[PDB]
């Protein structure tokens, strides 16, 4: 897979030249968020069970179809199949957030997810709410500076929530 440093080298080889000096100080903004990316990982990797409990607490309440006799997640391995699938949409986003792109997100999780739910009959309607119940649950969880100094992180809140909606449109 390729990363956020690699694509401006992938456009330095497939174009074919040396480095422009406007390509070098565009990477200064990557380390203007470089420490500020690193504590954003602490708001999601220290709360791994915390989001995926608090979201599937909510998701069968307004949508009681999943717990019906004859519903989808009925047996306990299918209910454990929800929890192994709710976290990886957040885990590969957590791989995408330390990366800075969505290459490894598309490589190992997303490409092969619309049709895999359709072959199994698990709905594309409600695997997007599992994105959306953890979408607002990490907008609140990462927007607080408990341990780190105070300034501007108004970019990267529109990047990890710039990756959940990428996972939302790649499944419906």
């Amino acid at each position: 897979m390729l990363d956020a440093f690699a694509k401006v080298v992938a456009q330095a080889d497939a174009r074919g030249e040396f480095l422009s000096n406007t390509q070098i100080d565009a990477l200064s903004k990557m380390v203007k968020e470089g420490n500020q990316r690193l504590d954003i990982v602490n708001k999601v990797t220290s709360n791994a069970s915390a989001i995926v409990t608090n979201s599937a607490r909510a998701l069968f309440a307004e949508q009681p179809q999943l717990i019906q006799p004859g519903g989808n997640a009925y047996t306990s391995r299918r209910m454990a199949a929800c929890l192994r699938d709710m976290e990886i949409v957040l885990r590969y986003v957590s791989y995408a957030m330390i990366a800075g792109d969505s290459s490894v997100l598309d490589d190992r999780c997303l490409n092969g997810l619309r049709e895999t739910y359709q072959a199994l009959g698990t709905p594309g309607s409600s695997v997007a709410v599992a994105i959306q119940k953890m979408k607002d649950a990490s907008v609140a969880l990462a927007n607080d500076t408990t341990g780190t100094p105070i300034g501007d992180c108004s970019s990267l809140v529109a990047e990890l929530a710039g990756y959940f909606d990428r996972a939302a449109v790649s499944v419906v």
Partner: protein
């Protein structure tokens, strides 16, 4: 863009938006003189519709500069006008003479009728006319039947119709129809399953076998597996395609079985350390790990999980997954 229940519409994102937006009917019983931007739009519509979005330049449109003018008073459209366009050198250069007889038949149904013929008894009725009564009655075998005199009254333009339940073709003719239609940016030639030199559906159109209906423009839709039949009567080979059946003790050992469809791997990707093993990069016999790509697997429900890992850690993209 991908979506089935994304905005309540299942087939606008399958590639049939403009084939369901337009209807292309003409409104006057003769083309009126004076204005030449209202009926030339009908002609260049049919020049992409009948030819299958092929490039007709003006260097060959003026070679065919009679046959549209007799339509403007004297021929009907869809019955006579594209019939006259089907008797041209430009129609005979793309869909008759670079390809076999069945491939000329099975591309003519997409051109003329807007469907795919199922089995061989629909190939029987069309190819009983070429070997007896030439080419001009072969083209006019389509135009004077119940399959042509009912769906279009004679002043529309023949559209695509091989997806609806009123077009009572088959259920397999749906599955061939998205082998033939790859969005609105292809042709007979710019189609990977068959170019102009080839034949689209040799086995599958004859034996009525349905296929994996892949949405076009998806991630890794650059896949089609090749053909070699297996067995010792027909002296075939083994190792090219996974089977379409999944019977036996490994049918229901791991639950319900599935057929996956891998797009393709390379040499960087096999290791779990993000690179290439610097060395001789091969074995001694100088083949790949997957020595031909676009391969496929048959796997039960209880090993879908490590196989989906083992494709995706190695650089393989997945076309679709169909249960067997």
């Amino acid at each position: 863009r991908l979506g089935t229940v994304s905005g309540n519409s299942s087939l606008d994102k399958l590639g049939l938006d403009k084939f369901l937006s337009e209807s292309n009917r003409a409104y006057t019983p003769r083309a009126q003189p004076g204005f030449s931007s209202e009926y030339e739009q009908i002609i260049s519509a049919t020049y992409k519709q009948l030819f299958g979005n092929a490039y007709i330049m003006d260097s060959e449109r003026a070679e065919m500069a009679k046959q549209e003018s007799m339509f403007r008073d004297g021929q009907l459209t869809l019955k006579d006008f594209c019939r006259a366009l089907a008797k041209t050198e430009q129609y005979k250069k793309r869909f008759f003479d670079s390809r076999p007889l069945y491939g000329a038949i099975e591309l003519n149904f997409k051109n003329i009728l807007g469907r795919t013929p199922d089995g061989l008894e629909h190939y029987r009725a069309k190819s009983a006319v070429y070997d007896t009564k030439g080419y001009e009655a072969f083209v006019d075998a389509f135009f004077d039947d119940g399959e042509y005199d009912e769906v279009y009254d004679d002043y529309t333009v023949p559209f695509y119709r091989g997806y609806k339940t009123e077009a009572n073709l088959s259920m397999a003719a749906f599955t061939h129809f998205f082998r033939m239609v790859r969005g609105s940016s292809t042709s007979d030639k710019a189609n990977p399953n068959s170019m102009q030199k080839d034949i689209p559906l040799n086995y599958y159109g004859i034996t009525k076998t349905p296929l994996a209906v892949i949405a076009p423009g998806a991630a890794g839709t650059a896949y089609t597996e090749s053909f070699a039949g297996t067995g010792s009567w027909q002296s075939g080979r083994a190792g090219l395609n996974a089977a379409r059946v999944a019977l036996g003790v490994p049918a229901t050992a791991n639950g319900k079985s599935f057929r996956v469809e891998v797009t393709g791997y390379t040499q960087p990707g096999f290791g779990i350390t993000a690179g290439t093993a610097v060395g001789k990069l091969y074995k001694a016999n100088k083949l790949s790990r997957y020595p031909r790509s676009n391969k496929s697997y048959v796997v039960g429900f209880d090993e879908l999980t490590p196989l989906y890992q083992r494709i995706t850690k190695n650089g393989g993209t997945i076309a679709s997954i169909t249960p067997l």
